[PDB]
Design a protein around this ligand. Structure first.
Ligand SMILES: *CCC(=O)Nc1cccc(-c2csc(C(=N)N)c2)c1
Ligand SMILES: *CCC(=O)Nc1cccc(-c2csc(C(=N)N)c2)c1
Ligand SMILES: [Mg+2]
Ligand SMILES: [Mg+2]
Ligand SMILES: [Mg+2]
Ligand SMILES: [Mg+2]
Ligand SMILES: [Mg+2]
Ligand SMILES: [Mg+2]
Lengths: 236, 5, 236, 5
């Protein structure tokens, strides 16, 4: 690891600077170095890790979709042959995306998840595991597409079980987990009815628990509840 | 695309 | 060169795909590979090259400025010591920026400029040479800061001399060259009066030649003239 | 910053 010689605290400080500079690849490399120091992550540190990789993979996903759309158009009737270049470059981006997903899943498996005992950390990492299997699922087409989908489902399910037992319905981690699992159902598992049911039930149970919250907690929860509502509006 | 966090 | 095995035409096709996917680092690598095939570049190809590296270095510059501002704030009176991390990371970004500038200047010197005989190509590449020396100047502080500034000035000057002899005052390359040389005067050479004079004279001489243009050429020239006016408004 | 192209 190229970050092996830098102090954990310096890696975290630089992750924060990289975020401020919108240098998300750097931010991710710094956080990977911090994880590899072997200590558990604080809540702030977990969010630095997720913010970094979400931005990196998010750009890769956006590029993959652009290229995939061009590729599909070139494979319609009446399209002029352009050669292998569109497929090759789509494959290049896809391979880089899969590499990032494998890196994140590797950190979670060595050894973030197994050391996470508190609900807030364990649910956070299992949600991440679901998310990065979902990104692999978005590009998968071969003999392991079903296994990738089930790996995503399994991670999300375990996170949901813990979150329902150990967190209030308004907890932002629990809310974001449900939002994303609902999208998994809609976009990956071809289960739009499960997607809609989950989003609705999550929204309504959070609504009923908002009265217990401070003004700052209320803002955090209602922000994610609005995303649930936005998706429901898109889907109904 | 739908919203995720 | 990792692009040595790919066809020139495939590199150009992939540069165009990378642009569409907003993958500017890839776009730049593809164009570098195309330049290194050794053939001259068409006008479209020259613009693919400049678009790619402008986006890459533009992001580096934006990050450098964020980090430089944080660094300067940490060096004020009453600021708590944070250690070497801010300087180190600013230096990391700076070194990557200088590397990109050196790569572009290397392509221009081996051998784009020496083979460029038409005004449109020679002015384009000399403007690029000025631009990338200007980006080096923005971060320079040592014994060669003055030499970097003069290298920028010299390139811009030769481009200006050719453009004035060989191109109409409304030519978009001539206009963008003058826009950027004017910024060089204002921001790099501490010559705001020269910056303002150049921008004004360029704008007025283009204004007087717009009558000779088609509707499409008129739109291209007036777009850059508005940037000259925007700068004049900022500076007066 | 001022405009460049
Ligand atoms: C779980 C507790 C928690 O969220 N605590 C915490 C403390 C300080 C900063 C953060 C945070 C969330 S996102 C973020 C960032 N993008 N830098 C930092 C969280
Ligand atoms: C100098 C002649 C010229 O501009 N010709 C030309 C032909 C086709 C496409 C371009 C062009 C300009 S910017 C661009 C891009 N960002 N892909 C392509 C120019
Ligand atoms: Mg130690
Ligand atoms: Mg593949
Ligand atoms: Mg249920
Ligand atoms: Mg050949
Ligand atoms: Mg330096
Ligand atoms: Mg003059």
């Amino acid at each position: 690891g190229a970050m092996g010689s830098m102090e954990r605290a310096s890696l975290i400080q630089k992750a924060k600077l990289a975020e401020q500079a919108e240098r998300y690849e750097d931010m991710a490399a710094f956080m990977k170095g911090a994880v590899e120091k072997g200590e558990e992550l604080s809540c702030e540190e977990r969010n630095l890790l997720s913010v970094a990789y979400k931005n990196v993979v998010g750009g890769q996903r956006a590029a993959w979709r652009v290229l995939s759309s061009i590729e599909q158009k070139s494979n319609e009737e009446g399209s002029e042959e352009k050669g292998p270049e569109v497929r090759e470059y789509r494959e290049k981006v896809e391979t880089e995306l899969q590499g990032v997903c494998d890196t994140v899943l590797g950190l979670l498996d060595s050894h973030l998840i197994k050391e996470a005992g508190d609900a807030e950390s364990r649910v956070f990492y299992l949600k991440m595991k679901g998310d990065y299997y979902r990104y692999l699922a978005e590009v998968a087409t071969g003999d392991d597409k079903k296994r990738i989908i089930d790996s995503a489902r399994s991670a999300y399910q375990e996170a949901m079980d813990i979150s329902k037992k150990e967190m209030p319905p308004t907890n932002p981690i629990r809310l974001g987990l449900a939002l994303n699992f609902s999208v998994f159902h809609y976009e990956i598992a071809n289960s739009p009815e499960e997607a809609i049911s989950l989003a609705k039930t999550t929204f309504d149970e959070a609504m009923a628990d908002l009265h217990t919250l401070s003004e700052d907690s209320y803002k955090d929860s209602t922000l994610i509840m609005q995303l649930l509502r936005d998706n429901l509006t898109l889907w109904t | 695309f739908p919203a995720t966090v």
